[PDB]
């Protein structure tokens, strides 16, 4: 099976990449761009899992 | 866009005192069709719909064992309860022998129930009553069992007073005590008479005689246990009547436990009542539960079969009180006697007062009860309409019999032959006839007469004029008006000189 990672793995990845202007990444550039086509799906999945005002 | 069983059915058919033909009548919504349907299921596990109102009546024949195991043949005319459609009631009445009033508990007597009662008395039929929807006193009104009994007894005495209004000699008054009354609630499978209740009581418990028991329950009788003997009032104890203490209290508690305690106490209450229920059936919603519990507890419908066996004349007795009113000769020298016999014999007399149309095409099915004789397919027959008088043979077309059918609610049972006493769907005597017709043997003579055309309870006073948009289309419209005249018993049509085709309805 596929086992889950600790949250700091992704938190660190995203923090590192910041906003892709540093030249270190610069191949992510084109994959980052290619993932645009699926961005309206991430938004739908985000908004339908909204947290419901009786929860913090 | 019943191989093994039809035979046995035919046996009861030929028997001619194993059968009873009844008409189910009553007010709007008072339960008839749900009773008939839940019963259709109890036998076969195998515009009206969309309006949710029954407009035209339906014939249903079924085999039901009564409280002794004796199978019977039942013919049921289930009729609309809407005041406007009493014409189908009168059809079913003239072709039927006794009448089951259905009366709603939380309503009682209202307009159509009263008028239908007057009608069946003046048509000289037997009167048996099912008080229906008694749960609307328990689950809906929540009446203490005593006051439920009050209202029940009130309903019964009022339908009594009403039959007193219209039948001079009180041979029969109504009381559950006699087999006159089922109490029921068609939705939950509850149908019982004092006989049936006492019978389950004894059949599970000790060896009490159920009939003496049955005869003790209704009517202000008490029970002091030390006496073990039932006595008109001598508890100043303030105790309940036997009817309460022995039928209303346990049924009330059955419901209360089911709708209340399904999770906590119902498994042990089922322990006591001897009803075993599986886990899945313990996992039901409450209305399916209720009907399951009550149906496992109460058996099929035995109160109905007992009432109908005991107080319906059964066409063999049947015909003689009938043919007086029906027939224009009544009983004189040839045919009154030949008929009143009811024997499969000779004359082959029949009275068809319904035209059930075949959804597809022009042809219809005539429908009625054969009084004397026996009819087989392919026979040639001579029909007489209402216009036909003894020396009017013009009205007497002649045809053959295409096929014969018996009716499950919306099922056809095609057959080879039908004896006297039974209802029948005839294919092929359709075109020559108008609203009411009667039939005799073809080209073989004895002589014929006709039963009086139907008298109706209502007078159609509402008047509606009709005309096609393209005057080219008049013949098709006239065929339409014929067809609707065939389907509807009281519909009047006329042609006003000033160019109108006019319809008279209620």
């Amino acid at each position: 099976q596929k086992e889950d990672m600790p949250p700091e793995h992704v938190r660190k990845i995203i923090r590192d990449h910041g906003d892709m202007t540093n030249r270190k990444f610069r191949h992510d550039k084109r994959v980052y761009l290619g993932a645009l086509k699926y961005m309206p799906h991430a938004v739908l999945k985000l908004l339908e899992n909204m947290p419901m005002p009786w929860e913090q | 866009t019943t191989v093994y069983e039809m035979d046995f059915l035919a046996d009861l058919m030929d028997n001619s005192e194993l059968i009873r033909n009844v008409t189910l009548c009553g007010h709007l919504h008072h339960g008839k069709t749900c009773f008939v349907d839940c019963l259709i299921e109890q036998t076969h596990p195998e515009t009206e719909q969309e309006r949710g109102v029954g407009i035209k009546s339906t014939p249903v024949t079924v085999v039901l064992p009564d409280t002794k195991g004796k199978s019977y043949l039942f013919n049921i005319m289930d009729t609309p309860g809407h005041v406007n459609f009493s014409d189908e009631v009168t059809a079913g009445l003239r072709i039927s022998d006794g009448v089951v009033l259905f009366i709603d508990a939380a309503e009682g007597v209202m307009l159509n129930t009263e008028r239908l009662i007057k009608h069946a008395v003046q048509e000289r039929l037997a009167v048996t009553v099912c008080i229906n929807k008694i749960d609307r006193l328990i689950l809906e009104l929540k009446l203490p069992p005593t006051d439920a009994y009050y209202k029940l007894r009130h309903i019964v005495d009022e339908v009594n007073g009403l039959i007193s209004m219209y039948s001079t000699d009180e041979n029969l008054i109504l009381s559950p005590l006699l087999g006159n009354v089922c109490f029921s609630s068609s939705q939950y499978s509850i149908c019982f008479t004092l006989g049936s209740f006492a019978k389950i009581y004894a059949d599970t418990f000790g060896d009490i005689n159920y009939q003496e028991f049955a005869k003790r329950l209704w009517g202000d009788i008490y029970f002091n246990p030390k006496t073990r003997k039932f006595t008109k009032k001598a508890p100043t104890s303030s105790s309940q009547r036997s009817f309460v203490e022995f039928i209303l209290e346990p049924l009330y508690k059955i419901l209360a436990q089911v709708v209340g305690d399904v999770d906590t106490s119902l498994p042990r209450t089922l322990d006591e009542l001897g009803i075993h229920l599986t886990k899945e059936e313990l996992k039901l919603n409450i209305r399916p539960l209720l009907r399951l519990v009550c149906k496992k507890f109460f058996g099929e419908f035995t109160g109905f079969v007992d009432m109908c066996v005991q107080h319906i004349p059964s066409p063999k007795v049947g015909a003689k009180p009938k043919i007086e009113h029906t027939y224009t000769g009544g009983v004189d020298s040839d045919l009154g006697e030949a008929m009143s016999d009811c024997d499969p014999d000779g004359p082959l007399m029949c009275h068809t007062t319904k035209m059930y149309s075949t959804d597809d095409g022009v042809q219809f099915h005539a429908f009625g009860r054969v009084l004397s004789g026996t009819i087989h397919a392919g026979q040639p027959v001579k029909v007489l309409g209402e216009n036909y008088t003894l020396e009017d043979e013009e009205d007497s077309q002649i045809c053959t019999v295409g096929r014969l059918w018996i009716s499950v609610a919306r099922y056809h049972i095609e057959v080879n032959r039908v004896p006297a006493g039974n209802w029948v769907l005839i294919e092929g005597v359709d075109q020559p006839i108008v609203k009411t017709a009667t039939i005799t043997e073809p080209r073989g003579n004895e002589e014929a007469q006709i039963f009086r055309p139907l008298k109706f309870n209502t007078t159609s006073v509402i008047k509606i004029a009709v005309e096609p948009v393209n005057p080219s289309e008049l013949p098709k419209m006239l065929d339409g008006l014929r067809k609707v005249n065939k389907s509807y018993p009281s519909l009047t049509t006329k042609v006003e000189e000033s160019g109108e085709h006019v319809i008279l309805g209620t």
């Binding site: - | 069983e5 035979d7 046995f8 028997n15 194993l18 002794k68 195991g69 004796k70």
Partner: protein, 81 residues
């Protein structure tokens, strides 16, 4: 409750024939037969074992003294048992 007693209870309205403890055979349309098989019927035609005849407009048949009961073939068509 007996399955044969139940078939007998059903036998009302049809023809029933009874061989008695003495061996006479009676035929008639059965009216009502109790659990104890006491068959109270009408129009019985009974032939005795030697050949003698007899008939009655009514008849009663004690239960424990019944030798056999044969009905018309209407029954041969309850099979669930």
């Amino acid at each position: 409750i007996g399955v044969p007693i139940k078939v007998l209870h059903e036998a009302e309205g049809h023809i029933v024939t009874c061989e008695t403890n003495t061996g006479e055979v009676y035929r008639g349309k059965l009216i009502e037969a109790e659990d104890n098989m006491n068959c109270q019927m009408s129009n019985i035609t009974v032939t005795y074992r030697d050949g003698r005849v007899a008939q009655l407009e009514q008849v009663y048949i004690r239960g424990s003294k019944i030798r056999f009961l044969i009905l018309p073939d209407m029954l041969k068509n309850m099979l669930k048992s």
